[PDB]
Amino acid sequence: APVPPLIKEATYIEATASGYMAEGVLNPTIILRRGQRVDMTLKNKLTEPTIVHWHGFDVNWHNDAHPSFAITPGESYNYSFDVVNRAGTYLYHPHPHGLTAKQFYMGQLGLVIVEDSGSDLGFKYGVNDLPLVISDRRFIGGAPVYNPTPMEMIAGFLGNAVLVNGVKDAVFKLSGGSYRLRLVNGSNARLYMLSIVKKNGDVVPMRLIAVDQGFLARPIEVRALFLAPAERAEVVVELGEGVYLLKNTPFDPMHLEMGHGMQEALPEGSEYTIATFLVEGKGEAVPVEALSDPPPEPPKPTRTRRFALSLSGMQWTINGMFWNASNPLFEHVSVEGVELWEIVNDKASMPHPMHLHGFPMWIIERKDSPRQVAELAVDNRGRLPTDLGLKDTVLIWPGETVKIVVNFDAKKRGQLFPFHCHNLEHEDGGMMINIAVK
C-alpha cells in the first residue's frame, strides 16, 4: 500500500524539479488540525519562478498565494495562517503563471489533510485510509516527457499511462475489510469516470462520504464517479478476499472544441485499470454510518452573474476574458456579497473543471447535462452525488450550465483571487481571471 509519508511539522519545504522536499522526503502529506496555526517557509530551488497554492484553503491572498507573489530561484516565501477549513482532503501545488503545468506534471504536488474531532472515522492513514492520487504521464523510453504541441495546449496534455501515488501499474496488498479511499485527480487534464470492480466480477458499490471541502450530510452509494483534475472524492468500500480493480470505465470525453478531438495513445474514454487491490486474509471491519460534520445550507444570493466558457480562436476565455501576463493584478471581475454564478460551457468546447480560490462553492443545479451525467444525478436539480457537498472545483460539460452560490465574505475585500480552469494546459494558456472582492 504505497502512499505518501506523513509530515507533522511542515515548517520548511523546498520546491525542486522532482517535487516538494521536506525532511528528506518527497511530496509528503501535510496533516493539520482544524483551528491550528500553520507556519511554513517555501524555498525556491528551481531555475524558474514558483509559488505554492493551498488548494481549497480559506486564507487571505497573501497566503493563497496569488500568482503575482511568485518568488525567484533562491528566494523564500512564508505562509502563516489559521486553518479554518473543515476536515477534508486538500492539495498543495505550484501556481506561477505559464509554468504551472510543467512544474506540477514533473512532480510538484502534495496532499494536505485537515483533521477534526472524529474525522478519521476509525480508519488509519496508510493502513485502511488510503489516498489514491491518480495522475497520468506520457512515457517515451520509459521516462515522462512534457512537450505539449499547440493543439495539446488547446485540448490538454494526455499521458499514455496512469499512475497512483507516483506508481505505474499500482498494486495494493490489503487484508479483507473496510477501506476509506481518498480519490484525487492529480492529472494535468485527464478526466476519469471511476469504478471499483471485482476482477471478472461485478461492480462494487462505493459509499461517497466526502468531497473537496469536506463531508456530505450522509453517505451516498454510487457505482461510478466522474473525477476531473483537482477534484477529490472520499469513498468507503468493503473488500472481501480476492482481486479488485480501480478502473476508468467508458464515457464520451466530449472534445468538441476543435472538430471532434484528436488521436490519443490512451483514449480518455477507454476502459483501463488504474490500480489493483490484492485482498488476502481477514482484516478489520470499520462501521461507517454517521458523518458528524454536515455541510452548511447555501446562503441566499442577491445578484446573479453569468459566465461563458469559450474558445476564442486559440485562446480559451471566460466571458471573453483571459489572463493578462503583463498585468497579473488586473481586476477582471469585481464582486461582493453572496452571488449565484451561472456557468455556461459552449457546445463547441470541452469539459472544464472550474476552480475558484479563496471561497468554497455550493452547487445549486446542473442543466442541459449530457445523458451520461444526467443518469448519475440524484435530485431534481440534476445534481451529482459529489455536487451535494461543499466544493471548490466543479466540472462543466459542453452545452451544460452549472449554477453555484458563493459568499464573497466582506472580510476579504481588497484582495484578488483566481477563478480558472484546472486543466493545467488551459490554465497556463490563460484561462484564468482575477476575482476582486469589493
> Is there a binding annotation on residue 53?
yes
Q: Which stretch binds Cu ion (CB under 5 A): 85-93, 278-286, 345-353, 379-387?
A: 345-353
Among 63, 135, 386, 423, binds Cu ion (CB under 5 A): 423
- How far the first Cα of the chain sits from its last, in Å, is 47
**Interactions with Cu ion, residue window 356-385 (CB under 5 A):** 357
Say which DSSP state 425 is in: H
Q: Which of 219, 429 has the CB closer to Cu ion?
A: 429
Q: How far is the CB of 224 from Cu ion (least distance, A)?
A: 22
Other CB atoms within 10 Å distance of the CB of residue 5: 12
Asked if residue 352 binds Cu ion (CB under 5 A), the reply is yes
Q: How far is the CB of 188 from Cu ion (least distance, A)?
A: 11
Asked if residue 232 binds Cu ion (CB under 5 A), the reply is no
Q: How far is the CB of 146 from Cu ion (least distance, A)?
A: 18
Q: Which stretch binds Cu ion (CB under 5 A): 32-40, 320-328, 333-341, 349-357?
A: 349-357
Q: Is the dihedral of CA 329, 332, 333, 334 positive or negative?
A: positive
Q: Which of 28, 94 has the CB closer to Cu ion?
A: 94
Asked if residue 426 binds Cu ion (CB under 5 A), the reply is yes
Among 224, 421, 424, 432, binds Cu ion (CB under 5 A): 421
Instruction: Give the β-pairing of 129-140 and 171-185.
Output: parallel
Q: How far is the CB of 194 from Cu ion (least distance, A)?
A: 20
- Counting Cα atoms < 13 Å in the Cβ hemisphere of 181 gives 31
What are the cell numbers at 27?
511530496
Asked if residue 86 binds Cu ion (CB under 5 A), the reply is no
Q: Which of 55, 332 has the CB closer to Cu ion?
A: 55
Asked if residue 95 binds Cu ion (CB under 5 A), the reply is no
Q: Which of 102, 426 has the CB closer to Cu ion?
A: 426
392 Cβ neighbours under 8 A, 6+ residues apart:
55, 56, 212, 213, 355, 356, 360, 361
Question: ∠ CA(414), CA(416), CA(421), 5° rounding?
Answer: 155
H/E run at residue 424: helix 424-428
> Is there a binding annotation on residue 332?
no
> Is there a binding annotation on residue 422?
yes
Q: Which of 97, 352 has the CB closer to Cu ion?
A: 352
356 touches 307 (CB < 8 A): no
At residue 104, the 3 state secondary structure works out as: helix
Q: How far is the CB of 51 from Cu ion (least distance, A)?
A: 12
> Is there a binding annotation on residue 426?
yes
Q: How far apart are CA 73 and CA 47, in angstroms?
A: 6
Q: How far is the CB of 237 from Cu ion (least distance, A)?
A: 28
The verdict on whether omega for the bond into residue 65 sits within 30 degrees of 0, i.e. cis, is yes
Q: How far is the CB of 255 from Cu ion (least distance, A)?
A: 11
Q: Which of 55, 137 has the CB closer to Cu ion?
A: 55
Q: How far is the CB of 139 from Cu ion (least distance, A)?
A: 24
344 touches 306 (CB < 8 A): yes
* Closest by CA position to 319, among listed 330, 329, 332, 331: 332
239 Cβ neighbours under 8 A, 6+ residues apart:
174, 176, 177, 178, 179, 204, 277, 279
Among 34, 55, 180, 207, binds Cu ion (CB under 5 A): 55
* Closest by CA position to 111, among listed 186, 60, 173: 186
H/E run at residue 40: strand 37-44
Size of the site for Cu ion (CB under 5 A): 6
Q: What are phi and psi of 125, to 5 degrees?
A: -55, 130
Q: Which of 113, 421 has the CB closer to Cu ion?
A: 421
Q: Which of 84, 140 has the CB closer to Cu ion?
A: 84
Q: Which of 206, 437 has the CB closer to Cu ion?
A: 437
**Interactions with Cu ion, residue window 60-79 (CB under 5 A):** none
Residues near Cu ion (CB under 5 A): 55, 352, 357, 421, 423, 426
Residues annotated within a binding site for Cu(2+): 53, 55, 93, 95, 352, 355, 357, 420-422, 426
Residues annotated within a binding site: 53, 55, 93, 95, 352, 355, 357, 420-422, 426
